[model samples]
Target chain A: AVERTLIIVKPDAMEKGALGKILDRFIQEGFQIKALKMFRFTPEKAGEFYYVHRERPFFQELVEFMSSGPVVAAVLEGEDAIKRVREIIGPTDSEEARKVAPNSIRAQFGTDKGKNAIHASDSPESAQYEICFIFSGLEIV
Target chain B: AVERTLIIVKPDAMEKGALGKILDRFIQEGFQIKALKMFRFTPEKAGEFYYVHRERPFFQELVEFMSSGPVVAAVLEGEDAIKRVREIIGPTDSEEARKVAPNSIRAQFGTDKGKNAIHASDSPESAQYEICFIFSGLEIV
Candidate 1:
């Protein structure tokens, strides 16, 4: 029942200096850190990574915000990894996300709709795409 | 006058569901939580975040490991928040501080050097960039 999922330590987490605590949440929930890296995104890279939502009105703003600074990107593996990871990350907008899901990651740290701290792939296909987008040369066991 | 420092929650702490407990370390130290969120890192973002040291070589493996799971990122504020926060977080790895810095956050949660849970900015400028990356439409003030 092991699965793989992608998680992003958005710029907000980095700024607040919560990387370790955030990571701890996943470890406690029983996920494996399969692959990891920390880096600043270029506008180009952000655009490509968020291609699926490219047409959204906030797409440009999202990319600009994401690429404007550093971000941590990682792949997590565990039982029901995708679903479990989402639970940990909570909803997309920290405000609404927290109201309905206080225990989620977003609830704990996210601020607003656009500046939500973390990003999790919505489905298995997207996970694969995101993982590949960031870790091209690496092999996943 | 922003600053950056590193923070980690360690494995034992995470296992014990000490996320809030660990966060209390910063609160006690008088740092403001400027921004915060949780997620695992992707290799790409990890590499970029740490790109300044890419040539030093621990880069690839380090990024892979850190991004392997979910992590919390945060921006802390206060007078001399960087140095003060590091003092609370303790040394580079947690074990070294367990005996000497028993009262430190690392001592409370960390087990090994590699598995330490949190990270913080090292200086004021980095803090500015890191904070800006994660937060928007607001300042740490």
Candidate 2:
């Protein structure tokens, strides 16, 4: 079952210069890079993108960090894309995430709770929401 | 001053079983791995971690997707670790980053914005916040 998910190469990833090695892994794994973009976001855009958790304590900080610099947004597609993608992304915190899921994305490159590196959709519903956020009217092939 | 930074290896990187290789990059660079772990996050934790960004439009979707899977996290240390790590990470979008930042980690393995593996901190402040969130006092050297 092919599925689509949204992934982001956070600003940290961009500045560190690990983009090439990271992308190569995806291409080699037989995943498709459907759509991609590189740009810095305005605080307004960042805030709008993360609107759901507006009341959280870290909400403001996270958005500021996200929009603080340039980032990479992408749409990925492949078999069992959702699960497979998560498997690759690993866990959220990177620290604990890597321990239990040593082979995950976070395990390999992640650093901490907030800056765990890659992001992936957890379910079909969320995937739809995220995909729509980054790509306008884009559909999974 | 010694600094901390976030790092993650994307799903593609994990699928390729490049954990060791990727980690090697950090070790070879003389960065200290202060804290390390791997685990999948519950949506609750993801939301909590990104609490500051909850108000952002993509907050719900971002947390939902990130918690949907497992990821790795680590606290890295070195002289000007934040800047150095970012340089190693290359660009946020693998496609553009790879062209100019050929030696970046993404250029070596990343495919696009979504799947471009890995993450790092953009500034010293972020390094502190991210490191503390995932690691305890004993973790940092």
Candidate 3:
């Protein structure tokens, strides 16, 4: 079965120039690169991007943190790519990733300041939504 | 430290639409994608891209094969990215990958049709040369 998923490289990772290493792991895992580009969000844009988390207290932090730097959004396609991607990316929290999935992306490349260095689509629907958000510089008829 | 490396999603992978998954893996591993686009080469163009390998027995076979379909060209940047990217992507031959780096990228998803479903620029000098071959349309300086 063919499936696609979304991944975002956050500012923290970009600053350290670690994004390449991050991407290296994915292709190594058997997923193929689809569409990719750099995007910088406005606070408003970030808010809309994570609208589902609006009710959560961390929403404001996420949006503010997200909007400030270069974000590389990409679409990946493969068999079971979505679940497999989320698996290696590990927990949302860096400490958890470091403790449990020590070899995971977040643990290896992420920061300790509550930043996991990535935003990944959690489900098929979310992946679709995220893919559209990034790939839609092309107009819709 | 930041390094730039050339990555090519071969005809077989592109035909299967594995480029998306291939791109996702790099972003996931923390590499910043500096440049990406699709290219359809004629034998003439493909011949130029792989000129260094011309003296090798597989040169004609490679040129014909690469020209047969679309290839995705990309520049990925990060710390030790050239080596690291190559590390994860594994050998050009999936069978050889299995014998050696069994858990490597090529072993995980690549087939045996043309060694594997990708192209590599093995060193800094080579990457610089290959990067220019594809990114000529984009102002890379």
Candidate 4:
């Protein structure tokens, strides 16, 4: 059975005007876009979403930083979708990724850790929880 | 600086038919839509996004489930945006949310954790890594 997951385009990518180009790569990679969207988040929501880190010293500041700009959230559907995405995107620390998948479609050179630029679900079931939380509008391309 | 984060209107919300009504909550709460669009997930992306839970038995099935429908992705901006936005949505579970904030934005959340109604950035600094890769386009917003 095919799985579905969320692929978020972080602000840094959105700001530079590569949405079309970036998405093109996914299609080129053989992944079908079941749905696509451009959307942003509110403050409180960011906090609750990261409530798991409530007790951590860096928790508050981390969520606060996420509020900097816009991010792209996408849902990709296909076989072994999650791992493949993780493979494509590479790693969380873009710097680390650059050293690893540098020049690769997933992580490119010059990308930073906090400013990594992409997000994939760590697991399958995780998609359902947040997908229903915040978002609207509808389209293709 | 008003922070921006990603928010998704999950498939279940569409199942309930209140994405717009719910979307209104963000606006009422003083959230600005810096960017937004609607889309769905690919299995591989879903799998990797949720890869953290791969060890769970239900993980695969859950990943497969994401492709079943469409979802909305949006990026909102505001002060203390992440935390404030999380406040509006209330909690992760709809039934549980109902208990927490009856008639509040999050209470109506659907009971499907898999179809989690929406997604918010857990941490701002953490978001940087995820935001830059997926999308871009800032000056306009």
What DockQ values do the models have? 0.09, 0.03, 0.10, 0.10
lDDT of each: 0.71, 0.69, 0.78, 0.63
Q: lDDT value for candidate 2?
A: 0.69
Model 3: chain A TM-score against the true structure:
0.92
Off by over 4 Å in 4: A135-141, B1-141
Write candidate 2's Cα lDDT for A31-89 as tens digits: 86665544456789877777767899999888988887666666778898888888777
* B68 Cα displacement, candidate 4 (Å): 18
**Clash count list over all predictions:** 57, 94, 31, 110
Q: Model 1, stretches more than 4 Å misplaced? A: A137-141, B1-100, B109-141
Q: Write the per-residue lDDT of candidate 4 for residues B45-87, one digit (tens) a residue.
A: 7676565568999888777775567665667778988778777
How far residue A137's Cα lies from its native spot in candidate 2, in Å, is: 4.2
Put down candidate 1 lDDT per residue, B1-141, tens digits, no spaces: 455444433334544556656765675566756544444457887777776678975678778877665555566667777888878877767788787898877777676776665666777666656555544534222
Quality of model 3 by C-alpha lDDT: 0.78
Interface RMSD of 2: 14.0
Interface RMSD of each: 8.7, 14.0, 7.1, 12.4
DockQ score for candidate 1: 0.09
Model 2, which residues run further than 4 Å from truth?
Answer: A137-141, B1-141
Q: After aligning candidate 3 to the native by TM-score, how far in Å is the CA of B123 from where it should be?
A: 19
Descending-DockQ candidate ranking: 4, 3, 1, 2
Restricting to chain A, the TM-score for each candidate equals 0.94, 0.87, 0.92, 0.80
lDDT of 4 at A39: 44
